[PDB]
From Swiss-Prot, chains A, F:
This is ATP synthase subunit alpha. Belongs to the ATPase alpha/beta chains family. It comes from the Bacteria. The record marks 30 as: Required for activity. Coiled coil: none annotated. The chain holds residues 342 to 426 of 511 of the full protein. Produces ATP from ADP in the presence of a proton gradient across the membrane. The alpha chain is a regulatory subunit. It comes from Paracoccus denitrificans (strain Pd 1222). It is found in: Cell inner membrane. F-type ATPases have 2 components, CF(1) - the catalytic core - and CF(0) - the membrane proton channel. CF(1) has five subunits: alpha(3), beta(3), gamma(1), delta(1), epsilon(1). CF(0) has three main subunits: a(1), b(2) and c(9-12). The alpha and beta chains form an alternating ring which encloses part of the gamma chain. CF(1) is attached to CF(0) by a central stalk formed by the gamma and epsilon chains, while a peripheral stalk is formed by the delta and b chains.
Curated annotation (Swiss-Prot), chain C:
GO terms for molecular function: ATP binding; proton-transporting ATP synthase activity, rotational mechanism. F-type ATPases have 2 components, CF(1) - the catalytic core - and CF(0) - the membrane proton channel. CF(1) has five subunits: alpha(3), beta(3), gamma(1), delta(1), epsilon(1). CF(0) has three main subunits: a, b and c. It is a peripheral membrane protein. It is found in: Cell inner membrane. This is ATP synthase epsilon chain. Produces ATP from ADP in the presence of a proton gradient across the membrane. Belongs to the ATPase epsilon chain family. It comes from Paracoccus denitrificans (strain Pd 1222). One of its GO terms (cellular component) is proton-transporting ATP synthase complex. Keywords: ATP synthesis, Cell inner membrane, Cell membrane, CF(1), Hydrogen ion transport, Ion transport, Membrane, Transport. Transmembrane segments: none annotated.
UniProtKB/Swiss-Prot annotation, chain E:
F-type ATPases have 2 components, CF(1) - the catalytic core - and CF(0) - the membrane proton channel. CF(1) has five subunits: alpha(3), beta(3), gamma(1), delta(1), epsilon(1). CF(0) has three main subunits: a, b and c. Belongs to the ATPase gamma chain family. The gene is atpG. This is ATP synthase gamma chain. GO terms for biological process: proton motive force-driven plasma membrane ATP synthesis. It is a peripheral membrane protein.
UniProtKB/Swiss-Prot annotation, chain H:
Belongs to the ATPase alpha/beta chains family. F-type ATPases have 2 components, CF(1) - the catalytic core - and CF(0) - the membrane proton channel. CF(1) has five subunits: alpha(3), beta(3), gamma(1), delta(1), epsilon(1). CF(0) has three main subunits: a(1), b(2) and c(9-12). The alpha and beta chains form an alternating ring which encloses part of the gamma chain. CF(1) is attached to CF(0) by a central stalk formed by the gamma and epsilon chains, while a peripheral stalk is formed by the delta and b chains. It is found in: Cell inner membrane. It comes from the Bacteria. Produces ATP from ADP in the presence of a proton gradient across the membrane. The catalytic sites are hosted primarily by the beta subunits. Coiled coil: none annotated. This is ATP synthase subunit beta.
Length: 85, 54, 75, 155, 260, 85, 153, 152
């Protein structure tokens, strides 16, 4: 009901909270229906691609857990994703 | 599925290796008995080049 | 025989194979011998005189009392 | 409420969270949207067969997904994985930059004419782009843009 | 929610059909791997016969480097998993023997091996990822490259030997220098030694492949049974929630009606 | 209620439909208790066999997306089934 | 009833039937139990950090358990095999014999001081006992009892 | 509904397509069907022992279904190979022609007395008829009717 009213939601999961992601925001499932229009020019200039990037990173991170050999490109993305996280 | 995680991690991976091998084609094209030779010589070369960006 | 399978397994009157030093024609009762062979054709006189030739990449020829066994390389 | 609404429609466009979650916009479910005008006698057999071909390769991928979720892709045949690659391309070629969505994508909207849609999707199902990368198909207009994106991806 | 359990049962049910089938395919491939091994066995026996004859009359000192020098670890593993502890067991044997002896160089054959060893401390000079049950031609390549490294100090080869479809014993074999069975003599020994090493590697490969598909046979067997066990427990919980939904929906309908 | 009242049922499925199986009838679940008694001699002569051959195909259809070390027999079941389908 | 009770509490200890059936007592769900006092400014950064670390590894193990149920442990990455190992040792080290349960267990009850609890758990998390067997950690007090038990075997 | 019903049932009869498609009529599942009174203190030790034996051999046969499917019957051990012959004969001897079905089969129905049934099967389990063909036990009454069908 309430989700269907508001201009977005910040969804927090116990899984993330306990694995160290605090505040425990699930980035894929949280949304803002106003978007960059609610950000300063400055913030927009840095944060425009952070959500996408972190989404790609989570996918690749699960993939790397297969131990298989990784090219330099993947390894750098993993490195950068872990640090951003 | 049940293994929804492995499911996605796999698709994403083998899609990356697909795209990455297209990039390797673009490398060997950017490098080009002898036609056959170079196509091998720079298949292997381009693959090392790609695994080495800086 | 090769690394993968049995190439010849039957009665033969004789074999002709090019050895490292020269040509070798092995008849029944030939004295025990081991020789490496060169790449080239091996002539096999099967059973009742029927001849067959096969190109081999080389290998080792082992001769004893009755049987002669060619251990052929694939390359 | 929604269940009793399906019966009053001539065309249903069903949006899925599972698809939205992938960055695929509009998040339309190609295996749960229908139209009463999707008939070869109304739209021509060209339009009908391509649409039908797109749905077939996607349902085949969907049936394949469970297998690769265990074995990975390596265990598939050259044909089994050729459908996987086209299916994922087609799924990406269904996405589209909306003009109304510029405030979200940071990209200019696109409008693709019907003839260009049918042609484009026909070619991919026929295999005429098995050499292009997936990313070339994502968030574009007509199939020319896919080729051009692939070119701008080279360098 | 029942929505999730509906699909969760579906997924486990489908996945069980795959594990069930893969047992049957692994069973088929073990036959064919054992059939081809029944040709490699006599082939290598004849080579062993000639090799034991030459070494009996091999002048002294000075012999040849390949029969006595005066550590390289070769590790044979699968590319794909789902083979239980097949790759774990073999890599434990490699780790163990290395810990006892050196207190090295590794040749990683197969992805599962290289993966595990690189993450630990990849002292990896050469690597191999061989596409196709591959034949003798691909064992010559690895034999020549490993000889190419011994030329210019000792090479040892780890693989899983058969016992049964359930048991597969990891073992180590020394490949270079070679070890005795316990037109010239020297000229034929100069070609047979590198060609013998080659066949041992190929024998170990075929054995290791059939050991892989035995391990997979019993691994996917267990997965099938575990899936059926999960399908029962999931169905029992699905039916609880199904009955609870009907019970509770009714109470709401009836509680509202009785207020009027 | 209606399933128990009737003499049999034709069950349709979305998965079958979008795969290209149209009409989207599940031959496995659908039934007619009247069955054989409602069809002509001609059809009776082939129908039962077709029903059985497609049934055999459906249970092993897990190999259609695998195969490899199959033998002549199982390979023939696959070939006929895909075609009868 | 219970759902409305949570809103009245400063700390919650949630017992789990699945845990109890594994023989782990007290059957406390380490990932569903919370305290408004677990704050670095209140308990200290060492205490705070060790708790988050324990819960981290337990949650990681939890996320794996589903994949282990069918395929088993051999399909985990050489790294996740390690978190599994420490996690399973941590699961057992959270178990503890009570004085009041002597009547059924037959094991003398134990009281571990908070300082000794943090340290013990830090060492396990850091890997200082990866060489100790699981069974050594089950139904003991402080870490010293773990090592002693590892000797009795 | 079924939970409340099961509180009153003393036995079950499970009829299946699988068994019907093997031609064994009636199409009763010999392992899925059960009875509360299948107990030595009720039906006697002789009845009980024979029954339990048939069940086991049918179970052991069902367990060999896997090894036989993917490899071949020419892989089972002599003990197993024998339990497959006795089991299949057992499965046939559970068949029975009915009077009610005289109009469709043309064959006379049969009413097998309990004592005859207990003993007949005891002999098959015992292996006292391993020298007869399967088809001798298919669709007959008493064990005698097996011996006869064989001679013809």
């Amino acid at each position: 009901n309430v989700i269907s009213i508001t201009d977005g939601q910040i969804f927090l999961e116990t899984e993330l909270f306990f694995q160290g992601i605090r505040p425990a925001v699930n980035t894929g499932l949280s949304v803002s229906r106003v978007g960059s229009a609610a950000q300063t020019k400055a913030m927009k200039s840095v944060a425009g691609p952070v959500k996408l990037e972190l989404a790609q990173y989570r996918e690749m991170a699960a993939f790397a857990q297969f131990g298989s050999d990784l090219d330099a490109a993947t390894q750098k993305l993993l490195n950068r994703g872990a640090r951003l996280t | 599925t049940t293994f929804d995680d492995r499911e996605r991690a796999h698709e994403a991976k083998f899609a990356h290796d697909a795209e990455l091998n297209f990039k390797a084609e673009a490398r060997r094209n950017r490098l080009l008995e002898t036609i056959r030779a170079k196509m091998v010589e720079l298949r292997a070369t381009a693959r090392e080049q790609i695994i080495s960006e800086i | 025989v090769s690394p993968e399978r049995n190439l010849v397994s039957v009665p033969v009157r004789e074999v002709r194979l090019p050895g490292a030093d020269g040509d070798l024609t092995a008849m029944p009762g030939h004295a025990p011998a081991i020789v490496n062979l060169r790449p080239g054709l091996v002539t096999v006189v099967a059973g009742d005189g029927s001849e067959t030739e096969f190109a081999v990449t080389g290998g080792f020829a082992e001769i004893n009392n009755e049987s002669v066994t060619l251990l052929a390389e694939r390359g | 409420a929604p269940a009793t609404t399906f019966a009053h429609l001539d065309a249903t466009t069903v949006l899925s969270r599972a698809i939205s979650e992938l960055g695929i916009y509009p998040a339309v479910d190609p295996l749960d949207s229908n139209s009463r005008i999707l008939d070869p006698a109304v739209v021509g057999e060209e339009h009908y067969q391509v649409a039908r071909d797109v749905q077939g390769i996607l349902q085949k991928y969907k049936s394949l997904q469970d297998i690769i979720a265990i074995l990975g892709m390596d265990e598939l045949s050259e044909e089994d994985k050729l459908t996987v690659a086209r299916a994922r391309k087609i799924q990406r070629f269904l996405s589209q930059p909306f003009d109304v969505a510029k405030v979200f994508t940071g990209s200019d909207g696109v409008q693709v004419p019907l003839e260009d849609t049918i042609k484009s999707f026909k070619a991919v199902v026929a295999g005429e782009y098995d050499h292009l990368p997936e990313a070339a198909f994502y968030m574009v207009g007509g199939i020319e843009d896919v080729k051009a994106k692939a070119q701008r991806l080279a360098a | 929610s029942l929505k999730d359990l509906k699909n969760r049962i579906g997924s486990v049910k489908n996945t069980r059909k795959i594990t069930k089938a893969m047992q049957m395919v692994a069973a088929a491939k073990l036959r064919r791997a054992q059939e081809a091994a029944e040709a490699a066995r006599p082939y290598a026996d004849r080579m062993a016969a000639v090799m034991a004859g030459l070494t009996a009359a091999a002048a002294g000192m000075a012999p040849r480097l390949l029969a006595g020098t005066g550590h390289l670890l070769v590790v044979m593993t699968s590319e794909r998993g789902l083979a239980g502890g097949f790759n774990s067991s073999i890599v434990k044997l490699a780790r163990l023997r290395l810990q006892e002896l050196q207190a090295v160089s590794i040749l990683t054959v197969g992805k599962k091996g290289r993966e595990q060893l690189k993450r630990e401390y990849g002292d990896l000079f050469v690597n191999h990822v061989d596409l196709s049950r591959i034949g003798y031609d691909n064992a010559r390549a690895i034999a020549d490259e490993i000889l190419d490294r011994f030329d210019n100090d000792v090479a040892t080869l780890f693989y899983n030997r058969f016992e049964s479809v359930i048991s597969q014993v990891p073992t180590a074999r020394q490949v270079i220098p070679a070890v005795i069975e316990e037109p010239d003599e020297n000229a034929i020994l100069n070609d047979l030694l590198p060609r013998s090493v080659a066949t041992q590697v190929f024998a170990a490969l075929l054995e290791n492949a059939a050991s892989e598909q035995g391990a997979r046979m019993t691994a996917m067997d267990n997965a099938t049974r575990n899936a059926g066990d999960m399908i029962d427990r999931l169905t029992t919980v699905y039916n609880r929630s199904r009955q609870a939904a009907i019970t509770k929906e009714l109470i709401e309908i009836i509680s509202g009606a009785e207020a009027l």
